[PDB]
A paper describes a structure:
Pull-down and yeast two-hybrid analysis demonstrate an interaction with the N-terminal region of the [name] dynein intermediate chain (DIC) MoDyn1I2 as observed for other dynlt1/3 proteins confirming [name] as the dynlt1/3 of [name]. Importantly, the structure of a complex of [name] with an N-terminal peptide from MoDyn1I2117–150 together with mutagenesis studies reveal that a di-histidine motif, widely conserved in dynlt1/3 proteins interacts with a highly conserved glutamate residue in the DIC.
Using this approach, and the apo-[name] structure as a search model, we were successful in solving an [name] - MoDyn1I2117–150 peptide complex structure by molecular replacement using PHASER implemented in the PHENIX platform (McCoy et al., Adams et al.). Notably, residues of 80–84 and 104–112, which could not be built in the model of apo structure, are present in chain A of the complex. Inspection of the protein-protein interface reveals that [name] mainly makes hydrophobic interactions and mainchain - mainchain hydrogen bonds with the MoDyn1I2117–150 peptide. Among these interactions, E138 makes a salt bridge with K139 of MoDyn1I2117–150 and the F121 side chain makes hydrophobic interactions with both the T124 main chain and V125 side chain of MoDyn1I2117–150. At the interface with [name] Monomer B there are seven hydrophobic interactions and one salt bridge, largely mediated by H34 and a conserved EXPP motif comprising residues 132–135 of MoDyn1I2117–150. Here, H34 makes both a salt bridge and a hydrophobic interaction with E132 of the motif whilst additionally the aliphatic portion of the chain E132 of MoDyn1I2117–150 also interacts with H115 of monomer A by a hydrophobic interaction.
Author numbering:
A (entry chain C): 122 to 150
B (entry chain A): 5 to 84, 104 to 153
C (entry chain B): 3 to 58, 63 to 82, 112 to 153
Write the structure that this text describes.
Amino acid sequence: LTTVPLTTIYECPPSPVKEIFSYSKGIQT
Amino acid sequence: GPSPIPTNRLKQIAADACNDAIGSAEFYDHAKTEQWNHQIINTILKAVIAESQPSDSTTPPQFKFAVNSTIVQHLVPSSKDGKPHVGRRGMHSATGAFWNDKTDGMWTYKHEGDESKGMDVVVMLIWIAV
Amino acid sequence: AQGPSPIPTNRLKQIAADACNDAIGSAEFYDHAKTEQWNHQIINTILKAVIAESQPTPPQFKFAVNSTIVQHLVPSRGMHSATGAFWNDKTDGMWTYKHEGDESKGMDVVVMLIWIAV
């Protein structure tokens, strides 16, 4: 009647955050 | 086995519930996640119950239903452009059951946020016959 | 509303804590390549134990076990999970459990049990 079936999933590999950097003005010479 | 509802219909039920709950959120808010999940769960339950129900009302409820909803914030950069990219923590969710294999079942949906959204939704639906 | 748990909750908490530490007690951190066997182990252990300890005669419950391993955020919240159901409020129910890792462990486990009578 009632049995033990196979197992199923939701899955997410770790992923690095996109870091936001600080920039200088920039010098043209 | 097979679901009481075609998976393509399930998919737009689940997608509508998620956008009904978080479609206008600008960001993840831990204070609202409980309301959001309540809402998503409520919407999906009512709808799978409706579309399950035979036109012959002399038939009593044929299924029991459970809906699990999870909201997960995206990783937040250290500072709080290049190509858009979503940071995510790792996770793995699985389910086992002691069931009637031919009548009972599960179905899952993911509502992936883009980088600007900042969060994902995962939905599991379980149906138990009779 | 919910029906009475077929196993005392204190017994469940220790079926669950034990299944978790068996599977991830020796792990040093979150390792995504092992999470599937980790959950495989956690679910099978909990399921076997509740089938065994719920019946005296035929089986009278349907059970579902859900396990989620979640990597910690990098140290100096971010996810919420909930379940709603349409069942028999006098016989059916659910139980949840968080196996909370400390900072060195780097991961949590979230377990849910659902039972459906007959």
